[PDB]
């Protein structure tokens, strides 16, 4: 609702939602590691990648 | 007219024609500690205007520490407009209190009521200090939480609007001493005094960094407010909207805390990864299936002023069948366009709104005796979906 | 067309203005030689830049911390030049090079998004005005950078990532590192001129490069599917230096502002528009009018349709102008005096 | 047809000529100092449409 | 009668204000030349750029709004000077507002000019004919601008004149005519109360 | 001019009793910006409308002046009403009144039982109702796109 109050020209854009899915990853595992591993102590989580 | 002599005579349609016109649903109102550069309250048209006409900084004028000049800046930064400025000058004296209500009436446009403070013990001073009959004649009051636990005591419950926490900037803005209102000329006057509130000063600058640069979030949402009401209708919900220029909350929030605040009508600002910063809650301190959601009490305050307005210039015109269609047409005309936005629910006008003006509908022999003229205006509201339900069945 | 600014601290101070450039001759008349900006700028004419802008803070010499080059682009003035200089597209800002990344502490990972945030609101003083903007070092900061921002303007921002290393040389022997918004810069003019705004800037071969101040394999987390993806220059086997990603900093998957051309264009259609609108500003609201608007529009947009520009077999499917007493309005908006045209696009994919 | 102020003050006539099918127009000569930023500055002068 | 209040000031003015009364009287005349006798002379501006010399609050007004009312010249911040308020020093019903008072006066001055030039006209059916018929047509052009309410005619006026049924036998052997007129005046919307749901 | 006006300071004065304001501009040099009168409602809020009544009862009114004792019958009402339609439609033609058929943008109506009754003719009154759909500036130009 852009409100006129000087003359001129005014500019709008459709702000109204666009829906649509998106796929996400369905594979993305968690591995349990045991409490003596130091690899792991002393951090919340590992991210590896390769 | 009377013709008298021979000739030509020419006569102008002077019968009322009326139209309802759409105003400004956004313009806030900030009351706080400000320094005005020049010695009411003062339209602001952007923080380059404020500047101009305001010394911005993290120091009162003498000490105290304000953050009304940082929450302005939010304020403008989350796509706010214009605005308006009430400083308070001195010691916080009851006539202050009593003439708060009255200033803010005389700006016409005023349509929410902020306080930038960050003291609780001022923020209460200045919410009890707007009368009932204030924020009953069409003004939105957005308050701070000051406890995640309990909701804020309030007046007018239905027209007010809590959020909570408070949210967190990295730098403040420091002014030179040539802007601190009594420094550059107490410098060269009298350096021992200088010395002394420079102690104050500074031990005042340490804590600030120390507790870290917590601004009140209600200057945010007010910009928030213009920012929606600009891009969607006064109908959307403040919601789901990102803020800018924001460093962290002040406190985390999970799904299950949250849900408590809600039942109490305490709006949330949560974080989430995939989307940042945003506003979670739309929900005002009223818990009745009307005045629920600030959209719908929102929505009704545009209506009836602006309604009210387009109504001052048939205040005295002829009680008869013509000059009510001619009212009931101008309203139904403002409804049908609300009704075409997305602004009011139902598949056919008949269900989104009714208008009904008559003689023997609305008014009766006596009332039109006495000099009253009734109207009945009904609307359908659109509520936001707070909840979304997805029910997956293996059909 | 895209004309750069360029934001930073000068050997020889100047005024609070920005000067026009043409050549490198016009910056050795203005400047003298050798700096960090300097350099860029120098590599932005020799990729085939035309004219740039260029804005000085300061001194070269004057240069104290990362807080204090964020609290120096915060000042009014710069804001106000930019907005009153009407042709300025591009905002760049090199000087971010000369700071170390020494952790990657919650220190530095806020200190990286006030500079997108302070650079974006430079970006909203005009519209149209698109950020070029730059990463940490490493991936690891990048990608938490990328997540962790959050501001209402990340349709305006786009970063390039790594730093680039040239055949420029001080007078000590060592190779000169440079942001890669300079190179990308001048790309965007050539392609501006040779292909036109809708032409993504991707998939191009840039010039003067040695090779990437990092490698290929580490920036695999830094592109992300749905939003807060990157754009990667990624030197290739047997094909030279190449520009790789055209993605802005858009978060929504759905949204068309999601590619650096589909913003760009948009912007480029929106200013002619309003070029073309302010000779209708007081003419009469009625029927001959809107038929001349809509032959004008009409007429220009279908000389674009046919350059490829727009995503459409027939033009009914290409765009769409409405404007009338019906369609477009009421008649309560004509004694209201306000005329509205509603205009609808569809833009390329790439 | 019009009536022009020319730099003096004419309201006295304005409001005495410019009537309903009199035919004329009036053109008046806005403040001599700096435009006031409130906006209050219309106060000298009649709503007249004329 | 009616009363007005406060008086009124300009620039020209340098010791003595201006009555209100003075002022009053032109609106009168330019109301009923544009909307009519029966339209209130209220809610219009003061033509002559004027002020009020004191000012007038909402609830002041308010307490003098009753009985023996006292019509305001109030100020409004976007539409500058009105006069605000129609009543009479009257209260009841018939003669509250100063358009209905005014109407019935209007109303009987055109009605007695006409009757006239029938003063010693003869006293039977055919003269009933005519002086009902004049007065339908004057009454009917009255409805027709909208100075009496009604969905039809008959709603908004009647006549009545005859042998059986205004004045009697003996009425007539002693030279008497007479005639009944009702009319339904239109009332000023003095209040706008809008309901929402 | 002697002062600059900014755009935010116009759009200050441009309501109600709205001052016009002579402005200047990078690309176009010194304009006049706005066309309001000192009255706000929609019938005379723009100069043009208002204008274009004045203009349009002066001719009118000058044209009339050569009927004034002209017998009061149906052949003088055709006359009249040709004569009004004519300069209504000219009008029409040339941009000045906004509708898509001359019956939506102006209406003349003169006759025994249309504008005036019997009691009227007898007393010498002929009346002419005239409706005008006067075209109004697009003081604000608003462009949306999706």
Request: aromatic share 10%; hydrophobic share 40%; net charge negative.
């Amino acid at each position: 609702t852009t409100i006129t109050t000087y003359p001129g020209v005014y500019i709008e854009e459709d702000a109204s939602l666009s829906l649509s899915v998106s796929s996400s990853a369905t594979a993305v595992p968690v591995f349990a590691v045991a409490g003596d591993n130091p690899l792991i102590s002393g951090k919340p989580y590992i991210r590896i990648s390769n | 007219t009377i013709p008298t002599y021979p000739g030509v005579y020419i006569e102008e349609d002077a019968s009322l024609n009326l139209s309802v016109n759409q105003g400004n649903t956004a313009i806030p109102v900030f009351i706080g500690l400000f320094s005005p550069k020049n010695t009411q309250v003062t339209r602001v048209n952007s923080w380059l205007d404020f500047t101009n006409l305001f010394n911005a900084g993290c120091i009162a004028p003498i000490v105290n520490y304000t953050t009304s000049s940082d929450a302005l800046k939010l304020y403008f930064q989350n796509g706010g407009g214009p605005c308006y400025i009430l400083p308070q000058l001195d010691r916080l004296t009851q006539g202050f209190l009593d003439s708060i209500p009255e200033l803010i009436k005389q700006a016409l446009e005023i349509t929410l009521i902020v306080c930038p403070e960050w003291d609780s013990g001022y923020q209460s001073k200045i919410y009890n200090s707007l009368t009932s009959s204030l924020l009953n004649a069409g003004y939105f009051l957005i308050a701070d939480n000051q406890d995640k636990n309990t909701a804020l005591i309030t007046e007018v419950a239905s027209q007010t609007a809590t959020y909570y926490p408070a949210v967190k900037v990295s730098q403040l803005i420091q002014a030179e001493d040539s802007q601190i209102a009594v420094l550059a000329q107490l410098k060269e006057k009298n350096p021992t005094v200088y010395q002394q509130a420079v102690q104050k000063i500074q031990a005042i600058q340490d804590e600030i960094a120390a507790n870290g640069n917590i601004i009140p979030v209600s200057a945010v949402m007010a910009g928030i407010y213009c920012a929606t009401d600009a891009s969607r209708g006064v109908w959307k919900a403040p919601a789901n909207i990102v803020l800018s220029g924001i460093s962290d909350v002040a406190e985390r929030l999970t799904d299950d805390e949250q849900g408590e605040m809600n039942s109490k009508g305490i709006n949330a600002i949560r974080y989430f990864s995939h989307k940042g910063f945003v506003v979670w809650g739309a929900r005002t301190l009223q818990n009745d299936d009307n005045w629920r959601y600030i959209p719908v009490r929102r929505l009704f305050n545009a209506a009836e002023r602006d309604i009210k307005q387009a109504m001052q210039s048939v205040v005295f015109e002829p009680n008869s069948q013509p000059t009510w269609e001619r009212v009931k047409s101008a309203i139904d005309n403002y409804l049908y366009s609300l009704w075409q936005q997305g602004a009011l629910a139902g598949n056919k006008p008949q269900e989104a709104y009714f208008v009904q003006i008559g003689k023997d509908v609305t008014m009766s022999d006596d009332d039109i005796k006495q000099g009253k003229m009734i109207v009945k205006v009904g609307m359908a509201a659109v509520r936001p979906a707070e909840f979304i339900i997805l029910q997956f069945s293996q059909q | 067309i895209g004309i750069p600014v360029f934001i930073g601290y000068t050997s020889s101070p100047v005024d609070k203005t920005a000067i026009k450039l043409h050549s490198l001759a016009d910056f050795a008349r203005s400047f003298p030689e050798s700096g960090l900006m300097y350099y860029s700028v120098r590599h932005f004419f020799e990729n085939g830049g035309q004219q740039a802008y260029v804005l000085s803070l300061g001194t070269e010499q004057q240069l104290s911390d990362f807080s204090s080059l964020i609290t120096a682009l915060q000042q009014a003035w710069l804001a106000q030049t930019i907005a009153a200089e009407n042709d300025i597209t591009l905002i760049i800002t090199p000087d971010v090079i000369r700071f170390d990344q020494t952790e990657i502490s919650d220190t530095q990972r806020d200190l990286w998004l006030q500079l997108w945030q302070s650079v974006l609101n430079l970006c909203k003083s005009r519209r149209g005005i698109m950020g070029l903007l730059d990463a940490p070092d490493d991936p690891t900061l990048a990608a938490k950078c990328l997540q962790q921002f959050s501001s209402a303007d990340r349709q305006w921002g786009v970063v390039y990532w790594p730093l680039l290393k040239s055949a420029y040389q001080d007078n000590t022997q060592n190779p000169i590192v440079l942001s890669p918004t300079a190179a990308v810069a001048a790309v965007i003019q050539r392609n501006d001129n040779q292909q036109g705004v809708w032409t993504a800037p991707a998939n191009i071969a840039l010039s003067k490069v040695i090779s990437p101040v990092r490698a290929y394999i580490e920036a695999n987390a830094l592109f992300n599917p749905d939003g807060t993806s990157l754009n990667l220059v990624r030197s290739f086997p047997g094909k030279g230096i190449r520009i790789w990603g055209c993605r802005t900093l858009e978060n929504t998957h759905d949204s068309p502002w999601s590619y650096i051309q589909t913003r760009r264009l948009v912007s480029y259609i929106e200013a002619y528009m309003t070029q073309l609108g302010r000779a209708f500003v007081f003419e009469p609201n009625n029927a001959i009018t809107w038929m001349k608007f809509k032959g004008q529009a009409h007429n220009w947009l279908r000389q674009l349709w046919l350059k490829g520009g727009l995503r459409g077999t027939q033009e009914d499917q290409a765009f769409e102008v409405l404007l009338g007493v019906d369609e477009s309005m009421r008649e309560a908006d004509l004694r209201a005096g306000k005329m509205i045209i509603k205009i609808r696009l569809a833009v390329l994919i790439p | 047809t019009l009536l022009v102020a020319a730099g003096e003050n004419i309201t006295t006539a304005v409001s005495t000529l410019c009537k309903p099918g009199k035919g004329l127009f009036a053109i008046f000569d806005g403040p001599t100092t700096e435009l006031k930023s409130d906006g209050t500055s219309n106060s000298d002068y009649d709503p007249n449409p004329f | 009668a009616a009363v007005y209040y406060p008086w009124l000031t300009a620039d020209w003015t340098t010791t003595i204000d201006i009555p209100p009364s003075a002022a009053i009287a032109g609106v009168y005349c330019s109301v009923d030349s544009t909307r009519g006798v029966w339209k209130a002379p209220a809610n219009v501006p003061i033509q002559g750029g004027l002020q009020p010399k004191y000012p007038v609050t909402d609830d002041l007004q308010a307490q003098y709004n009753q009985g023996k009312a006292l019509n305001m010249i109030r100020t409004f911040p976007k539409s500058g000077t009105l006069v605000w308020g129609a009543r009479t020093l009257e209260d009841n019903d018939n003669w509250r507002y100063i358009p209905v008072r005014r109407l019935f006066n209007s109303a009987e001055r055109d009605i007695k000019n006409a009757m006239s030039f029938a003063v010693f006209e003869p006293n039977s059916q055919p003269t009933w004919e005519r002086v009902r018929s004049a007065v339908n047509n004057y009454l009917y052009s009255l409805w027709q601008q909208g100075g009496l309410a009604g969905n039809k005619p008959d709603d908004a006026y009647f006549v009545q004149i005859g042998k059986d049924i205004t004045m009697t036998d003996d009425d007539i052997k002693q030279g008497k005519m007479i005639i009944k007129i009702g009319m339904a005046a239109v009332r000023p919307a003095e209040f706008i109360i809008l309901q929402f749901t």
